[PDB]
Design a protein around this ligand. Sequence first.
Ligand SMILES: NC(=O)c1ccc[n+]([C@@H]2O[C@H](COP(=O)([O-])OP(=O)(O)OC[C@H]3O[C@@H](n4cnc5c(N)ncnc54)[C@H](OP(=O)(O)O)[C@@H]3O)[C@@H](O)[C@H]2O)c1
Ligand SMILES: O=C(O)CCCc1nc(-c2cccc([N+](=O)[O-])c2)no1
Length: 316
Amino acid sequence: MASRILLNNGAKMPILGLGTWKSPPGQVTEAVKVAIDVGYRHIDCAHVYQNENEVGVAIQEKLREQVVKREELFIVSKLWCTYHEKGLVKGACQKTLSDLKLDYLDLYLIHWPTGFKPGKEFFPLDESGNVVPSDTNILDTWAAMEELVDEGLVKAIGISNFNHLQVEMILNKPGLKYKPAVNQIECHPYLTQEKLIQYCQSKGIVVTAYSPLGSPDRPWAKPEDPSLLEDPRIKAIAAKHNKTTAQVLIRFPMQRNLVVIPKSVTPERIAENFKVFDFELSSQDMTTLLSYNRNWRVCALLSCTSHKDYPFHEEF
Ligand SMILES: NC(=O)c1ccc[n+]([C@@H]2O[C@H](COP(=O)([O-])OP(=O)(O)OC[C@H]3O[C@@H](n4cnc5c(N)ncnc54)[C@H](OP(=O)(O)O)[C@@H]3O)[C@@H](O)[C@H]2O)c1
Ligand SMILES: O=C(O)CCCc1nc(-c2cccc([N+](=O)[O-])c2)no1
């Protein structure tokens, strides 16, 4: 299987990347250094993760060390919800660029369709804990994203956690200048996303699967929660192919023509997780994994469920 997928901006995106949500700032520099050493060329970042400076130290050292060239790296970051106003988007991008010590991003995503009130708080709340929305709408934010392409700050723009109606809204935006290149969404055998993925692919939008391992370190994990890594049915498929469960869970989206971004700060796992290009799941394996769907989401916050733009009321 090829290692990159062609985007609708003409650039190629590595289909395996390293996630960095929850990667501790004191561990993620070494994690990214190790990742590049063992072959990763795509790093998934975000301002809200509060570790972009430390990710950048790693990227810069490996560029200076001549382990890799910048053109060979695919660095993604995301515009946080409190910066959807037109006048705040460039600054938000430039802070990400300064922290990552880059002069462009390969891909910048609108992190969520929901805009929040600007200010220092990433999740501004009212007295009863509802997030405070902003009045910006997604189409003006999108035009601000298009400006970043035209200023050379980013090579591609896209979206994340957009539902099909929301993707459609961007695609039908009056005066649309650049189509989203990517929609990054939660996707794994308990949330298989067939409808949203086929819609996006039919429009030439590449889908990135996040939390492919079910995010076992998410802060709100509950006993009763399903566990991909521990699911005996998936362990069995892994056993059959002489791979680990995680390797199965990473290969699965790759064979759906998705990009996948498993997170780890554990060197042995970082290496393990990249060793997924030398085996194939069968069609039957794939259909079996798809059958485990239960519409289970890692990422869906109660505090945002009344925002007008909350993406997960619609089926997809
Ligand atoms: N667009 C958005 O809204 C959004 C939302 C969620 C996630 N994402 C992106 O997606 C990335 C991946 O999602 P995620 O961080 O939620 O979780 P994930 O990649 O599904 O799972 C990460 C967890 O799995 C562990 N793990 C990694 N490799 C393993 C292996 N081979 N064997 C056993 N355990 C392993 C990691 O542990 P150690 O780190 O301790 O090894 C960590 O606890 C994020 O980091 C972020 O970059 C984007
Ligand atoms: O940004 C990441 O990579 C994941 C951080 C964890 C996470 N964020 C959210 C979150 C943030 C903003 C909006 C929503 N919403 O449901 O409308 C959910 N739910 O879960």
